[PDB]
Structures are given as C-alpha cells and as structure tokens.
Design an enzyme around this catalytic site. Structure first.
Site, PDB file in Angstrom:
ATOM      1  N   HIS A 368     -68.631  17.991  65.151  1.00 43.86           N
ATOM      2  CA  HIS A 368     -67.610  16.999  64.902  1.00 43.86           C
ATOM      3  C   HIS A 368     -67.897  15.701  65.609  1.00 43.86           C
ATOM      4  CE1 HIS A 368     -65.635  20.823  64.385  1.00 43.86           C
ATOM      5  NE2 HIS A 368     -65.024  20.192  63.431  1.00 43.86           N
ATOM      6  N   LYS A 559     -52.920   7.664  64.073  1.00 39.95           N
ATOM      7  CA  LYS A 559     -54.251   8.143  64.474  1.00 39.95           C
ATOM      8  C   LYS A 559     -54.147   8.568  65.934  1.00 39.95           C
ATOM      9  CE  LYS A 559     -57.279   8.117  62.013  1.00 39.95           C
ATOM     10  NZ  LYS A 559     -58.532   8.510  61.382  1.00 39.95           N
ATOM     11  N   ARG A 560     -55.259   8.908  66.580  1.00 38.21           N
ATOM     12  CA  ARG A 560     -55.248   9.035  68.044  1.00 38.21           C
ATOM     13  C   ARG A 560     -55.121   7.606  68.615  1.00 38.21           C
ATOM     14  NH1 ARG A 560     -60.077  10.308  71.774  1.00 38.21           N
ATOM     15  NH2 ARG A 560     -61.233  10.092  69.738  1.00 38.21           N
ATOM     16  N   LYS A 565     -60.017   2.971  67.077  1.00 36.70           N
ATOM     17  CA  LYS A 565     -59.212   3.182  65.898  1.00 36.70           C
ATOM     18  C   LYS A 565     -58.608   1.810  65.465  1.00 36.70           C
ATOM     19  CE  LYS A 565     -59.130   7.901  66.450  1.00 36.70           C
ATOM     20  NZ  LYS A 565     -60.094   8.893  66.012  1.00 36.70           N
ATOM     21  N   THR A 667     -59.425  13.464  58.191  1.00 36.25           N
ATOM     22  CA  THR A 667     -58.550  14.383  57.541  1.00 36.25           C
ATOM     23  C   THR A 667     -57.199  13.862  57.275  1.00 36.25           C
ATOM     24  OG1 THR A 667     -59.792  16.091  57.885  1.00 36.25           O
ATOM     25  CG2 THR A 667     -57.489  16.485  58.534  1.00 36.25           C
ATOM     26  N   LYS A 671     -54.736  14.045  53.074  1.00 36.25           N
ATOM     27  CA  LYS A 671     -53.258  14.113  52.867  1.00 36.25           C
ATOM     28  C   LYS A 671     -52.723  12.763  52.416  1.00 36.25           C
ATOM     29  CE  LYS A 671     -53.827  15.966  57.237  1.00 36.25           C
ATOM     30  NZ  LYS A 671     -53.790  15.360  58.543  1.00 36.25           N
TER      31      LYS A 671
HETATM   32  C1  PLP Z   1     -53.833  16.148  59.628  1.00 36.29           C
HETATM   33  C2  PLP Z   1     -53.346  15.593  60.898  1.00 36.29           C
HETATM   34  C3  PLP Z   1     -53.961  14.484  61.455  1.00 36.29           C
HETATM   35  C4  PLP Z   1     -55.453  14.346  61.345  1.00 36.29           C
HETATM   36  O1  PLP Z   1     -56.006  13.272  62.109  1.00 36.29           O
HETATM   37  P1  PLP Z   1     -57.043  12.255  61.448  1.00 36.29           P
HETATM   38  O2  PLP Z   1     -57.939  11.688  62.462  1.00 36.29           O
HETATM   39  O3  PLP Z   1     -56.380  11.095  60.792  1.00 36.29           O
HETATM   40  O4  PLP Z   1     -57.878  12.964  60.440  1.00 36.29           O
HETATM   41  C5  PLP Z   1     -53.331  13.830  62.485  1.00 36.29           C
HETATM   42  N1  PLP Z   1     -52.195  14.338  63.049  1.00 36.29           N
HETATM   43  C6  PLP Z   1     -51.665  15.484  62.561  1.00 36.29           C
HETATM   44  C7  PLP Z   1     -50.643  16.183  63.363  1.00 36.29           C
HETATM   45  C8  PLP Z   1     -52.208  16.090  61.459  1.00 36.29           C
HETATM   46  O5  PLP Z   1     -51.578  17.154  60.890  1.00 36.29           O
END
Ligand code: PLP
Ligand code: PLP
Lengths: 828, 828, 60
Positions: A368, A559-560, A565, A667, A671
C-alpha cells in the site's frame, strides 16, 4: 447427539416470529422488562433477534468446510474497520422489511434504534475499510475466509471540535457490550515475549520468556443473500492472572502491576502508523502478538479439521500450502514469515529447507505505499531484546536469499547491499517489506500505476530476480454497503430499470449508460440526490447544526487531514470564491456548500493547525451578512464509516486533489463514483483507472501530473514566484497572515503561511490556478442542471471494476487459487 | 411497548420445549454445535435452559414489588457461600424431572453435567452459609429482600494437599463466566476515597476524593415453589479508565498504574476476618466500598419506587424506615451507620437528630462473637486518612451517646470510658461494635447462651442503658439445599410417610416421631443412609482414591482447622484406637472410617501443621496390614458446600468437639441432624439447644462443660497431671515425638507434642477421657442397627427448630417488622 | 553558592501514610534528579516538568 441439531431454531421471516424473538431477548437476555427498558436496550434487544438468525447460517456454513475440506484463506490484518452492523446484517439477510415492520408494530422506530449502534472502534483508516470491503465480498463469492486482526478496547480516538481545534476524546465503543461478538476463553493461547535462545542437539530453545495471554472473540460476517456467513476472529490480550505468589518472584515487589498493564495494554488502543510517536516496542508488540496467536489457530485447524485423516505426509505440511493461504496486509503482519519458520523448524522439526518451501507457497503480501522512506523497518536492538529467535531466523533467511542473489548476478556487490534485509546506517534495522517479498510467492500493488511503480523503481532488483512474483489487484468497494445500505433510492431506480443481478458483479451497472438520455432519468436521479441532500442539511442542522442550503453545489472532501491531501488547496479556493463575491456581490455564481471531514494525527501540529484554519474560515465567511447564503464552509467532526455512509450521498463534487503520484490507489474515490458524484482530481492513484473507464470527458482531472512534479524537482520549486503573478493569491496569503481570518490571534496562521510561501513540500501554489480554473469548468456544468445529471449516469454505469467482488475474484483466482463460487448455500 | 411482554415465551414445562431450549442455547447462545461442544458447553447450555425459567419469575416478582410497595429488607454481609446453583434452582422450580428427561433423550448424562459447575468463590465459612440460607428462606416466606455483597473474582483459595501440606491455588470460579449473573453497567456508582472535609456555611463537604466506581452484577434467588425470585446484587470494583489525559496530571507519571491496580483489586480477593495479616487498609477499603455503593442503590430504589407519591413529609426520611430495613451481619458492614448519617445529614439535608432517629430505626446488628478479643476495631490514624468525613461523624456520635450514659448513670465516669466507641491504649482505635449498638434499633446474638453472654458479659453496660435493643435469634438451616437436594433419599421416605407439606416448615418432621417403631421405616431409613455411604465411597475411590469399606461407621468432623476445634483430640483418640486394634488384633472392634476435612487459613501454623498430622496419621494406619479395614483416616480435601452436600448424607457420627464456651452456634451441626446422623460433642453453643430438642438421651454430650473450664482455670491447668493420670496419653504423646508418624523427620511434630505438653490453651487432654469413654458408648450402638436407627429418628423428627425459615420468620417480626406471607405469586 | 536537591529522608512511616505503598520512592528520585542532570535549553525533548521544576528550585 443428533436430537441436538440446528433444525429448528428460528421461524425467520414472520413478524411475527421476529416479535416473539425481540420479546424473549429483551426480557430473558438483557433481563430488563417493558416498564424499565431504554432505547439502548431495545437496540440490544433487536441485535440479538437478527444475530440468532446469523449464527444459524454460520454454524452450517462452518461445518460445510469440515466435511468439504476447502482451501481456507486467512486475511491477516492489524486494523479492520467494520462500523455499524445491524442494517448490514438485515440486507445481506433480507430481514430488513420484516425487522422494520416487527418493530413498527412493536411501536419502535427501526432507524431510531439503528443510530444507537456505534462503529466498531476496531480499525481506523482506509486500509481498514478495505479489509472490511474485502470481508463481505469474500463471503459472497462462496470463499472460505476467516479474518484475524486484534480487538481494541478503545479502538482509536473520537473527534470533537473545540473552539476550532481538533479535540480528541476516546472511543470505548464496548462499554455496554457489543452483541455481535462471542468471546471464547476455551481457545486461549500463550504468546511468548522476550526470552533467551539455547541451541542444543535437536534445536534451539527460546527459553526464559514473559508471556501475554491472547484470547479470541469471534464476529460472524455474512455473505450477500446466499446464506454463507464467515468468521472474523479477533484477539484480546490478557495478563496471565497469577499475581500474589506465582514463580514466587513477588514477595516484596510489583513490577507485575506493570506486566498486567503492558501485557493487557497490547489490545487496548490502536496506534496507526505512518506516524505515532516513536516506533514503540508496543507497536511491534501488537504486530508480534496478532501473528503468534493467529498462526496457532491456523495450525490447530490444519492438523485438526479432518487432517488427522487427510494427513498423509506425517501431517507434513506438503498438504499445508494446498489447504492454507495467509494474506499479509501491509508489512504489519510480516513476522508471519519468521514465525511460521520458527513453529515449523523448531517446534515440529521440518528441516529448514522444506519448511521454507512451505512458507513461501503459503505466504503473500499486499503493498500500500508509494514512497520508500515510509516502508516499515525495525531495529535489531528491538528484535534482539524482544523477539531474539526470530532475529536469528531473519539473519539466516537473508544468508540464503542473498546467496540466491549471488547465483543470479555474480559480482554486482552493490545489489547484494540493496537486496538485504539489514539496512546498515546511522542505526541498523531490518526492512520489513524486503522480508515479505522473500517469503511471499506473490506481492501486489494496489492499483494500476502503483504496481508498475513497485516493479520499476521501489522493488526493482527484487522484480529483476523474481519477476514472476509481482502482480496487480486494483482495490474495490463493496456494492452492498456502498450502494444498497448507504443509498436505497439510488439502488431502486437502477433495479427499477436495470434490475438486480448487479449487486454481486457490479458491471451490469453499465446497462444504465444505454439509458442516459431519458428525460425522466435525468429529472429522477436529480430528485434522489435532492432527496438525500435535504436529509443531510437536516443532519447539518438538527444533530450538528449550521444553516446549509439544499439547493447548492456539494463540495466534499473527506480524507486523512495530512498535508499531501491538499486540504489547503481547498481553503485557498474557498477564500478565492469569498473574495470575488465580496467584490461584485450582486453576481450570479453557482454557489456551494464546502464540507471537509477528517481527523489529524495527534501531535502532527501542521495538520492540527489546518483544521483550525478550516474552522476559523468558517466563523468568518459563514457569519458574514454580504455572502448571505452564497458560500458555506463546514468542518465534518468525527468523520468515520457511518458518517461516510451519509456524506457520500448528498455530495456533488468528490474533491480528490492530492499531489500527483502521492496516493497509491484510492477507495473513498470509488464509493464517491457509485452514488453519483463528479470527481475533481489530479491523475493520481485511483482517479487514473476511473478516468480510463468513465472516460476522460466525464472527469475533472487537472493539474500538474507526475511528470511535471518530478520536473519541478530538477528545477527547485520556488513558491514565491506564483505569489507574484497571481494577484488573488497575493491577496489570500495576504489576508491570512495580516490577521484577517483570526483578529484575536492574527499571527496564528503564520505557520501555514511560511509553510506555503516557503517550505511547501507538496507544491500547493503550483497547482493553484489550474485548479481554481478547473473548478470554474464544474461551476459551468451545475448551472445547467440537466447536463450535470448527464455526466453523472455516465460516471455511474462505468463503476463495476470498483467492486470488491472484482478485486476479490482476481485475488481468489490468481493467488489464492480458489475459484469464487456465486452459489446460494442451503440453510436454516 | 405493551405487545412486548413476558406472558408465555416459554413453552415452559415441556421436554417438548426444554429440549428445544437446550437446543437454542447450545447453538444460538453459546454458539457451538453438536460437533464442537465440550461437557462444559452442555452444562452451560442446560444452565441457560433453566435460567429462562428463572428470570421470567424474577421479572414478575420485581415488577410485583413495584406495584405493591412492601418493606424492603437489605441484607449486608461480605460473603455469600452460595455453592452450586443448577440443582438448587431446578428444585425450587420443579424442573428436575423435566430437565432430566430432556437431557437424557438428547443423550446427555444430567448428573455428569452438574459436576461441571464450580462453587461460587464468594463465601468462605459458616458466616457466608448463614447469609445464603437466610436468602433462601427470605424468598420462600416471600420477603422483598435484596442481598448485598462484594463479587470476588478469585474466591479465597482451593486447598490442594501437596505432600501432606496444604497448598493454596486460586479459584477463578469465573474463568469461563458464570451464567446466572446479569451485570448491570447502567447503574454503576462512585465510591469516594481519602479527600478532605471543607466546612462551608450550609455544611461539610468531602472534596478532593479519589474515586473507584462500583458496578453491580445481579444473581437471582428462587424461592421454593412459591414462584418468587428475589435479587442478590454483588458489587464489582472498577477503576475509572480515562488513563491517558485526565486532570492533565499525566504525561509525567503513573503511579496511577496503582489506581487501576488497587482499586481493581478491592474485588479480586477475600480477606476473611479474625485473622488476616495486619488490619490493612484493603480490608477496610472493601468494607467501605460495599457500603457506599449499597446505600446509594438503597436510597435510589427508595427515592424511585413511588416515594414522592409516598413522600408525604418531603419524601422524608421520617418515612424511610417503613420502606427500608438494613441488616449489618457482623461488624464488617458497620460503616453503614456513619454513611447513612453522612448522606442524610450532608447530601440530603436533615439535622443530625432527625437523621439519627431514622438511622437507629433502620439498621440492626447481628453478632457472631461468643468471645471478646476478636471484636472489630479500626485505628483512627487508619480512618482519618481514608475516611475523614466519616471520622468526624463517629466522633460526634460517640460524644452524643456518652451524654445519654451520664444522664442515665450520673457520675459513673468509668462507665463512660467503656461505653465509648473511641478506645485509647497502644494506639487509638475506634471500636466498631459499640458503633453498631448506637446505630441499631436491635442487637441479636445467634444462639441462646451466645445471646445471653452478649447481654451479661460482652456488652453489659449497653444492656443496662438499653434492654429493648438486645435479643436472640438462633441460627437455622434450609431443608431445601440441606435435606431435599443434599439427600433426596431421606427426603422420599419422609414424604411416602408424612407427605410433602413439611419442606415449607420443618416442624412437621416431628410427625415422624410416632414412626420410631414401624419396622418398614427403620430399615428404609437405614437403606437410605447406606445408599448414601456407598455413593460416598464411590467418590473416595473414584475422583480421588482409597478403600473406604461402605459398611463401616463414618466418623466426620468438617469444621475450620483450628486449635479450638480440637481436630487434635480427635487424632489422639484415632491413634489410640489404632494402637488398641494393633495391640489386641483379633478382637471385636466396631470399625470406622474417620474423615476430617477443613481449610487451614494461610499464615497460621498449628493449623497448617495439624493438617499434615491427619494426613500422615492416615498414611500409616491406611497401609498397615495388621489393621485390614478396621480403620481408615481420610482428610477431606477442599471442603466447600458441594463436598458438604456429598459428605453430610453419608456420615454416621458428627464430631462437634469444641472446648466448652468457645463456639457461638454452628450451622454445620444442624445439617448433620436432618441427614440422619448422630452427634458426639461437648456442650457448646448450638449443641445446647440442639440437645434439649431431641433430648439429651439421643446426643452423645461428652466432656467438660463451661463451668468446669473456669474451674481448671482458677484452680490452674496442668496438662502433665492429665498426662500422668492417663497411661494412654503417654501412649500417643510418646508415639508422636519418637517419630512413629514421621519416617523421614521424627522431631517434625515436636511443635505440637511440645505445645500440647505446655501451651494448650484449649485443654485437649482434659477432655481426652470422657471423650474416649463416650465414644466406646458410640461404637456400642453401631453393632445394634435397629436401635442406632431409632436414635436417628428422634433426631431427624426434631430438627424443626433449625430451619432458616424459623430463624427468618422471627427476624421478620421482632426486628424487621414484616409479616412473612407464604403465598404463591402466580406467574409464568 | 550552588544548590543540590535532597528528598526528606523519613521514608517508612512519616506522614502516617506508609506501610502500604511506596510510590514515595519517586520523590527520592524526582527531587534527587532535579540536580543530577543539565537539560540545556533551546532543545531538550519536551518542555518537561523537570526543567520548570529546576528553574524554581535554584530561584526559591
Ligand atoms: C472508505 C472510507 C474511506 C477511504 O479513504 P480514502 O483515502 O479516501 O480511500 C475513508 N473513510 C472511511 C471511514 C471510509 O469508509
Ligand atoms: C454450613 C457449612 C459450614 C458451617 O461450619 P460449622 O462450624 O459447622 O457451622 C461450613 N462449610 C460449609 C461448606 C457449610 O455448608
């Protein structure tokens, strides 16, 4: 004896029968009545009514694999981010209707009870929601998988904004139990720690060790509507409770008070890395833990479940790589390889070479990261203290690998010191990723671009010695969680025309492409999103307030809250937008509600700061009488999977703006596609394969690509440069440090200023203009409410590559070897 | 809501349904199947099939009380020696024959299953059995009684005799849980420690406290077929858990590891009284803990259940005593009295004199110390630090009580410094028993001579100021555990004959008096007891091992191992007996199986030594071929209620051999009568009233009575004078010290020879002769089976004084003020 | 005039506090190492309580 059987125990689908099972559990399990019960009791009441029904299937499902001996593939991960469980169990189990009805009759609001459940404080980032997307798809495709990780008492923290600043409280999600788990103190297992290695005639003994007891809590996780239900096995640490006298070590002294607080405290709280504050013996303590426990189960169950029968090679593990498959998420389980080698060489006696053939045929590792300073490495001072026999097993592994390397390239001695597991330096460590490549038969990147990067830069000598071990598997999203429960409407019209088939191989969603033009599609789906947003502008008022607008363009970024970001990109453009609309007020502008959710990383100052600025931004714009209802800025407190199940559907614009090639996959991205949003973003990570499906026409790809970013490195990015062309940017670094957006503490965002004007690693000012401007191409499309909606179906049809279903059948078929059944299994 | 109801969730009493529940629980609850279940899983499953039956009633009873609003009595004690719950929960509920059929058909052995349950390690002696027999008889004559104690996680050890020596293993009874309890997170309370008394204008304030959180778990106590089930609430101690931030004192130091260690271990372990090693703050900390938590649960339930309707005088605690009763069993819950004062004066806001009237009318003390120097006393240096608000109130109560003595005894300035509750001497101590006499509206001894001496010697001045407080209530025993379930044999025949009526009141067993001379009965009685002795030899030869001839006389003593329980006397007469058989071999000798059992108390030495005396003594006679099977000695290992349940029905003689004036009463005694056994014993405490019921002519009273003790004391005692009179005392003293019972270590028992010879506080030798005279009378009888049994009959039919149902219907009327109903409550 | 920290040395009873726990070992090591070590400024690893502990000590 056989009168004791599964054949009878629940009437399923009657409301009726369901209301009697809410009536038993509430009174007999919970031992509360009608007069003193409370909502949390009544959700606990209902959880058991449905769990009844899950374990039914579970048992069958499980004994299916004893007599049908299938390959068992284990998805070893140290974070599993499952969130809410009641609705999900209902859809996969069909009971939703019944359930509703039953509690509606029983005079109880099912949604009112559903937000009484909280997320499993169990995982934390994307890579968590990832093994929770794969878990559901694994079951669905008839696949014998158990998932092992740790059970965290405290998960990982809860976010409350306070006076701007991210304030972190703690998640004791279990407080009042969690009904979906069944703890198991019969299958407790001793995990060794510390010690000493005596080498004698038959083998090495790893003597004198402290021990931490590890004992297992099983959660069942269902398949979609085919009646398989799988085992999530969680571990929990227990200090062997042998205190007043055992080993007659204490008399005068307790340090044991601390064994029983530093053993136990292994599964207390989650630390997630690529941070943390200092590579603490506690993180390595958790990673050793999860693997020692998990592997014992794996052998208990290779030798047991009819392999006291199916032996046939001295239970020699030749049958083992045929039957077991350990899937190493990130480098964090890497001790699975040295440990499998310890168990096997030391504890049975399989000569090193057989049990190494066995190891690599069993193991496989999923990468990853995109950037090499962030690959995990651990110091020989820590593995020597703590896991000594193991350290030895790594040195003697590396002996042999580097010979493999010596047969292969005679005389390239610098590649011999480029391949090693010991990186000599300032301080000498083991590179845990290089261990995985040497004990896994198959390493994969996690998105297209990303494995090409592992193959031709990062792991390129490894790929040169063993090309045949690298693969790709683009991560997915599960359509159940991320279509059916998080947007019911949006699945009604899809089946209203296209008609279910798809929710188990999402590619049929493309049929609705052939259905663009219809003038109803276009006004219907708009209503849906316009359904969804009202609901959110309620959330954004009632349980967490503001004065949103439904009518607005919905600018989402969740995001984080790290640097790379570009949350700040977002902020320069909002104030952009607020400055113009302060100059010519009376001006038509396709307005928006900007929403930025995330948590920071306790102690990462910049990220703590950015959130403050994003809130502060908010007090100022969102309370100015000339912007009126035109801009809105909302910080999304305590962003998490169940907030994600709601923010994603009100959202128009999926901001996916991270500096080129920083993200290795993506990811939230997927969604965000499937629920109809337009996705402004760099060609990075995942927007790459999304763009090559939806087609470039339909996206908002922009900005300096990788090429360009690596060329602004040969050229020295000078930031003050753009500073001087752009009058706006001049004018917005201006206002910040002047003290605009903070008159009680003007100086404040001086930090961020000096980060941006002067030390910006991720190149904010460079991607400004082409971003400001790219946005004006979407602010184009959302005046013209028809065409917006035309893009959208065209993004949506395209999405069935972003199916966990997919991601899984590939892992399944190409590594695991098992062929993914879509068969509905029998069952009561 | 109202459709949500109890009314008929059980198919109730149908094998047809009960099998089907041992089938929902083995699968849905437990979550195992036919395949994977261990015995344990089935005892677990059965436990739950019963438990449903149990909680339906419990629900109906407690809501019953809500509606009717009767007086609630709360029983505080620090120990409840419950024992096993399955077979007792089934007879009080009738299920034994439906639960048998049912398990039998699914082919599971119901008694094998019953040996899986571990005794609650919640009690430890005669005082914890008292409380759980009153608890049975409180449900049986329908009293709304809660029981309150600490929920110990680890008991108080399991005796295991390693090499003759007692070794003490922890008893984590809860290891695999306990199913009967339902823990209540919802109604967790604080227990405030240390801290400081601020005196503000309206009153005191206890500030700066450290806080443990007391959280309840309840068990249910079924009444005998009268359909009520009352509550028993045990308090588990729980450290507050926000360890990483709170008060923002951490960062630097964790000595706070000790909060979560020393708050936590207030419930890990028992500390059993009149001993211990040193009057620790933990002892007193457990003690204040169960009280602080409980008088909140007690005033909670008082404010809640319909009391502002039932207000009338500002919910006033004027009317608190009509609705509350507080039983301080021994001094351990005494702090109950400054704390109810503390809450009502500080928290609520009455004045002292009002709280005082309401305190003394609510609490009643019960006493178990026949002798004085065991009387509980805390050092005020030890109460100031920990409990400062409470020190103040005990000083004011002492001050105000003293003014009453002077008003009543003008000028008796030494009575004042006796009747005081603050003692001065080496260190200033507070005498907690005088503190109970001042806060109780009644003081009760637990035997006639016991309760007499409390009045004439122990608390004499108090008796003189307050007649209306002292009283007597002799201990009783339940005919349920201790006739119906320990021995159903003797229970069938007593009903084919006088027929079930008697269990709900023991006095009807007198109706069997007339049956002395039926010759069916007489040989039935005897067949019954033989069927037990034989059963009992199956254990002694199976799950432990030897050769107890089933036909011999069973001599049993199973009291605490102590100096004044004379288990030495017993061994001297045994090795005597040994000698005589060995002496004159071919003789008629009436043979025996001497079984002695008891747990020492660690950190007592004569007691740890005496256990090695009876194990070695046996090891000799128990292999000596010239003895054959004339004698055995067996040490009953790990004496607890489920070994009692096994030995009492098999026993022939009970050994009640105390030194006169050492016991206060004794419940074991009584258990021995009902199970159709004879009684040699000195004229101590309970034996008095036991004998006058059956008549002297049917017990074996032997020895020195009290008056004769005081005589050998004034005139002066000298063991070597007895020693010189009795040549057979030279006979084993000699034998003891020579080394005849100690092959590898002669001098080992010199500690006991020596002590016996010069430091026997208990006059073993003075009772040697009448004892070995009285025992030659005992062997007589066993040769005449017809009359032995006629003695057995005038005992069994005379027990009636000794049901806890007697004891309790008296407690209810003279102290508590409730009339015990016997009405069946109707319920599902 | 230079100063060295020394915890009060009454450690078994004095305050009528112990016979129980000795946490109290720590004043005789967290007072004791007020003068046992330089913590030199414009750096250090974290503005510890120990440096504020030392500024006040030489001053008071
Ligand atoms: C799916 C999901 C994301 C995934 O993070 P990304 O970096 O945008 O792919 C973020 N937070 C939650 C809780 C999720 O379920
Ligand atoms: C009732 C009982 C006792 C009582 O001890 P005595 O001195 O005989 O009164 C002891 N142990 C157990 C397990 C009991 O059942």
């Amino acid at each position: 004896r056989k009168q004791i059987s599964v054949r009878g125990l629940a009437g399923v689908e009657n409301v009726t029968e369901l209301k009697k099972n809410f009536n038993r559990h509430l009174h007999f399990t919970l031992v509360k009545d009608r007069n003193v019960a409370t909502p949390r009791d009544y959700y606990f009441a209902l959880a058991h009514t449905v769990r009844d029904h899950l374990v039914g299937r579970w048992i069958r499902t499980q004994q299916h694999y004893y007599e049908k001996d299938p390959k068992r593939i284990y998805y070893l991960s140290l974070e599993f981010y499952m969130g809410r469980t009641l609705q999900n169990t209902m859809v996969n189990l069909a009971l939703e209707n019944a359930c509703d009805e039953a509690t509606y009759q029983l005079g109880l609001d099912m949604e009112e009870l559903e937000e009484i459940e909280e997320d499993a404080g169990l995982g934390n980032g994307g890579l968590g929601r990832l093994a929770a997307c794969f878990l559901d798809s694994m079951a669905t495709l008839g696949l014998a998988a158990y998932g092992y990780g740790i059970r965290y008492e405290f998960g990982i923290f809860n976010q409350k904004i306070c006076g701007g600043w991210q304030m972190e409280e703690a998640d004791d999600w279990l407080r009042y139990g969690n009904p979906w788990e069944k703890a198991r103190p019969e299958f407790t297992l001793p995990v060794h720690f510390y010690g000493r290695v005596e080498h004698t005639s038959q083998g090495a003994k790893w003597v004198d060790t402290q021990v931490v007891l590890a004992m297992p809590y099983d959660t069942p996780v269902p398949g979609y509507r085919n009646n398989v239900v799988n085992t999530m096995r969680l571990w929990s640490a227990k200090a062997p409770n042998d205190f007043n006298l055992k080993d007659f070590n204490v008399g005068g002294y307790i340090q044991a008070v601390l064994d029983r607080n530093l053993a136990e405290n292994i599964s207390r709280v989650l630390y997630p890395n690529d941070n943390f504050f200092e590579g603490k013996e506690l993180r390595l303590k958790q990673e050793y833990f999860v693997v020692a426990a998990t592997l014992q189960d794996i052998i208990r169950r290779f030798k047991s479940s009819k392999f006291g029968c199916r032996d046939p090679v001295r239970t020699n593990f030749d049958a083992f790589p045929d039957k077991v498959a350990i899937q190493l998420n990130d480098t964090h389980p890497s001790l699975a390889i040295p440990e499998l080698m310890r168990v096997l060489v030391d504890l049975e006696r399989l000569d090193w070479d057989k049990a190494w053939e066995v190891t690599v045929k069993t193991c496989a590792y999923t990468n990853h990261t995109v950037i090499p300073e962030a690959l995990e490495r651990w110091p020989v001072h820590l593995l020597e203290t703590l896991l000594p026999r193991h350290l030895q097993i790594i040195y003697e592994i590396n002996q042999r690998f580097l010979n493999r390397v010596a047969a292969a390239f005679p005389g390239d001695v610098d590649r011999l010191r480029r391949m090693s597991l010991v990186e000599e330096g300032a301080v000498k460590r083991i590179n845990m990723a290089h261990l995985c490549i040497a004990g896994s038969h198959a390493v994969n990147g996690v998105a297209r671009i990303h494995s090409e990067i592992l193959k031709k830069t990062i792991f390129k000598d490894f790929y040169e010695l063993e090309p045949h071990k690298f693969q790709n598997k683009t991560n997915g999203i599960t359509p159940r969680r991320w279509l059916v429960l998080c947007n019911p409407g949006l699945a009604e019209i899809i089946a209203e025309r296209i008609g279910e088939e798809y929710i188990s191989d999402l590619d049929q969603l493309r049929k609705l492409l052939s259905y663009v033009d219809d003038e109803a599609f276009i006004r219907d789906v708009a209503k849906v999103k316009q359904e969804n947003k009202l609901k959110f502008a309620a959330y954004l008022e009632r349980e967490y307030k503001v004065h949103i607008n439904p009518n607005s363009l919905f600018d989402v970024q969740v995001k984080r809250i790290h640097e790379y970001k570009r949350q700040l990109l977002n902020c320069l453009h909002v104030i952009t937008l607020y400055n113009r609309i302060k100059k010519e007020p009376n001006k038509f502008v396709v307005p928006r509600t900007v929403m930025i959710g995330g948590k920071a990383a306790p102690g990462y100052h910049m990220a703590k700061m950015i959130i403050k600025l994003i809130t502060a931004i908010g007090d100022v714009v969102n309370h100015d009488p000339v912007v009126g209802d035109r801009l809105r800025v909302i910080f999304l407190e305590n962003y998490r999977v169940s907030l994600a199940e709601k923010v994603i559907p009100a959202a128009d614009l999926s901001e996916q703006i991270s500096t080129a090639g920083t993200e290795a996959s993506g990811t939230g991205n997927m969604k965000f596609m499937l629920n109809g949003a337009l996705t402004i973003g760099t060609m990075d990570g995942a927007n790459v394969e999304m763009a090559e499906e939806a087609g470039e026409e339909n996206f908002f790809i922009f900005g300096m690509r990788v090429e360009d970013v690596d060329r602004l490195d040969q050229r020295g990015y000078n930031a003050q440069e753009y500073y001087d062309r752009i009058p706006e940017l001049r004018q917005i670094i201006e206002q910040l440090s002047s003290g605009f957006f903070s008159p009680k503490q003007p100086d404040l965002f001086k930090d961020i200023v000096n980060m941006l004007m002067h030390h910006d690693r991720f190149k904010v000012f460079a991607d400004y203009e082409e971003y400001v401007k790219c946005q004006e191409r979407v602010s184009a499309l959302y005046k013209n409410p028809r065409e917006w909606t035309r893009m959208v179906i065209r993004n949506i049809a395209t999405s069935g590559k972003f199916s966990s279903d997919r991601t899984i059948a590939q892992y399944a078929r190409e590594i695991w070897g098992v062929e993914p059944s879509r068969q509905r299994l029998p069952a009561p």
